[PDB]
Design an enzyme around this catalytic site. Structure first.
Site, PDB file in Angstrom:
ATOM      1  N   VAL A  79       0.830  -1.202   0.000  1.00  0.00           N
ATOM      2  CA  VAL A  79       0.000   0.000   0.000  1.00  0.00           C
ATOM      3  C   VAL A  79       0.872   1.263   0.000  1.00  0.00           C
ATOM      4  CG1 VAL A  79      -0.498   0.697   2.421  1.00  0.00           C
ATOM      5  CG2 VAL A  79      -2.388   0.459   0.805  1.00  0.00           C
ATOM      6  N   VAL A 110       4.572  -0.603   3.727  1.00  0.00           N
ATOM      7  CA  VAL A 110       3.307  -0.683   4.413  1.00  0.00           C
ATOM      8  C   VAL A 110       2.464  -1.703   3.658  1.00  0.00           C
ATOM      9  CG1 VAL A 110       1.229   0.619   5.137  1.00  0.00           C
ATOM     10  CG2 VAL A 110       3.440   1.739   5.246  1.00  0.00           C
ATOM     11  N   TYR A 123       4.718   5.433   3.045  1.00  0.00           N
ATOM     12  CA  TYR A 123       5.917   5.500   3.880  1.00  0.00           C
ATOM     13  C   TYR A 123       7.119   4.745   3.271  1.00  0.00           C
ATOM     14  N   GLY A 124       7.454   3.620   3.896  1.00  0.00           N
ATOM     15  CA  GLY A 124       8.560   2.774   3.477  1.00  0.00           C
ATOM     16  C   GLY A 124       8.294   1.371   3.960  1.00  0.00           C
ATOM     17  N   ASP A 182       2.436  11.812  10.462  1.00  0.00           N
ATOM     18  CA  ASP A 182       3.580  12.283   9.738  1.00  0.00           C
ATOM     19  C   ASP A 182       4.171  11.055   9.046  1.00  0.00           C
ATOM     20  OD1 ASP A 182       5.772  13.616   8.743  1.00  0.00           O
ATOM     21  OD2 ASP A 182       6.660  14.087  10.662  1.00  0.00           O
TER      22      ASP A 182
END
Ligand code: BAX
EC number: 2.7.11.24
Length: 333
Positions: free
Chosen positions: A26, A30, A27-28, A160
């Site tokens: 689906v 996820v 950041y780094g 964030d």
């Protein structure tokens, strides 16, 4: 202790408890996953190389410490934190279980046009989450539409990650150099987001940090002498005074026929002087939020220990401390 299963997703090896099923990218790193314990859909984040260096290791502990503290409706929360490791000794991976974000704020606009009631509700919720965050002595510093998750009910949380350039929403004091940030760098960003919700357009779509600050100055003016008093750096000062004086524009003129109370609040948020900026707790009691404000359902955070921030430690120490935090996790109701 839970029972795990391995899989290739993708070129990455994922080892998660059986509780989490039907993992899909689906950041780094996820995966969306089905949390069979609650029936809910979750984001499971696997951190790459969490302990590869001292900076990576501090980063990992900082993120875990923060997620574990965050207990508010308008702020991302930690549903679970797991490692396949059995001992400190085999401890190498950290997985974060968060609720799944579908759409962010931008995805929400780029679907549909917003009522003034939508702007009211959206910005109400950002401020209420920020009130909580600020009270833990935390400063977000990268508030922008991509960092705000909004559901189908237009209910919102602050997160964030790490469009959509961060600079467009950056307080002017950040794009020069400070440090000596105060919390209302985050109110500036909110100001910038709120105008954009009203206007349908990026308030300060700078091409870079210079062009950015040019755009900022037009609207709010060049600083006056009372703000020029507070500027320490020699130039620093030979940019602001070396740039032709600008009048502070009439917000009522700039913000069309938006609600006049949203125009008032904007004025009070997008002040060039960070000291005169309305705070989050103050913005909540503004007349624009009369339909949503409740002084008794705008909670503050438990005390938050960030003394670790002043510590320079070894990789193994940062890593041991993260392992503790993993072990001491208490799953929420
Ligand atoms: C489309 N789906 C996804 O890609 C996806 C990925 C997700 O993973 C995430 C997992 C963890 C985080 N960690 C933070 O958010 N860290 C954070 C840091 C400082 C501060 Cl100050 C805060 C704050 F503000 F909340 F307090 C939060 C962010 C996203 C979640 C949902 N969806």
């Amino acid at each position: 202790r839970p029972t795990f299963y391995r899989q290739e997703l993708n070129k990455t090896i994922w080892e998660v408890p059986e509780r989490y099923q039907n993992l899909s990218p689906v950041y780094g790193s996820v995966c969306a996953a089905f949390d069979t314990k609650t029936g809910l859909r979750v984001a499971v984040k696997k951190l790459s190389r969490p302990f590869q260096s001292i900076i990576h290791a501090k980063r990992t502990y900082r993120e875990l410490r923060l997620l574990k503290h965050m207990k508010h409706e308008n702020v991302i929360g930690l549903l679970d934190v797991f490692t396949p490791a059995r001992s400190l000794e085999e401890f190498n991976d950290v997985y974060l279980v968060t609720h799944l974000m579908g759409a962010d704020l931008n995805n929400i606009v780029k679907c549909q046009k917003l009522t003034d009631d939508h702007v009211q509700f959206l910005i109400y919720q950002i401020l209420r989450g920020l009130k909580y965050i600020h009270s833990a002595d935390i400063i977000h510093r990268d508030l922008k539409p991509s960092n705000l998750a909004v559901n189908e009910d237009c209910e919102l949380k602050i997160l964030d990650f790490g469009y959509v350039a961060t600079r467009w929403y950056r307080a002017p004091e950040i794009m020069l150099n400070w440090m000596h940030y105060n919390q209302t760098v985050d109110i500036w960003s909110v100001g910038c987001i709120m105008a954009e919700l009203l206007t349908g357009r990026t308030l300060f779509p700078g091409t870079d940090h210079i062009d950015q600050l040019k755009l900022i100055l037009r609207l709010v003016g060049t600083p006056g002498a009372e703000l020029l008093k507070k500027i320490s750096s020699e130039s620093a000062r030979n940019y602001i005074q070396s740039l032709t004086q600008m009048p502070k524009m009439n917000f009522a003129n700039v913000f069309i026929g938006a609600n006049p109370l949203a125009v008032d609040l904007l004025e009070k948020m997008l002040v060039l002087d960070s000291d005169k900026r309305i705070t989050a707790a103050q913005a909540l009691a503004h007349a624009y939020f009369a339909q949503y404000h409740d002084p008794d359902d705008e909670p503050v955070a438990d005390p938050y220990d960030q003394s670790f921030e002043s510590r320079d430690l070894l990789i193994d120490e940062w890593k041991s401390l993260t392992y503790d935090e993993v072990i001491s996790f208490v799953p929420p109701p």
